[PDB]
Design a protein around this ligand. Structure first.
Ligand SMILES: [Zn+2]
Ligand SMILES: [Zn+2]
Ligand SMILES: [Zn+2]
Length: 85
DNA sequence: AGCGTGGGCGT
DNA sequence: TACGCCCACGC
């Protein structure tokens, strides 16, 4: 991990330079992406994409066992587990 | 439950 | 450099 965060209070290191640039945003407070609907700003594009689903009601991921739908894959993953117990 | 949000990393 | 995934933690 050749890329260390320069903020003295922080000590995060990364493998690629782009990971450092993305991380740096938590320190600069920069949020490049804005929701066309509610105007809220976000630090990342992928998080804006999933956030928008809260407005549209879009749920692309369904449970293979019960068919319950979710807006995010990690929500589906957390849910499928319950069918074990 | 619903969802913000950082980290890793393939491409 | 950027997108967009999985992943995971936190409330
Ligand atoms: Zn930092
Ligand atoms: Zn919004
Ligand atoms: Zn299910």
């Amino acid at each position: 991990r050749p890329y260390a965060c320069p903020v003295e209070s922080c000590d995060r290191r990364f493998s690629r330079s782009d990971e450092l640039t993305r991380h740096i945003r938590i320190h600069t407070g920069q949020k490049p992406f804005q929701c066309r609907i509610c105007m809220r700003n976000f630090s990342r594009s992928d998080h804006l994409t999933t956030h928008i689903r809260t407005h549209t009601g879009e749920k692309p991921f369904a449970c293979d066992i019960c068919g319950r739908k979710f807006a995010r894959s990690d929500e589906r993953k957390r849910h499928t587990k319950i069918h074990l117990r």
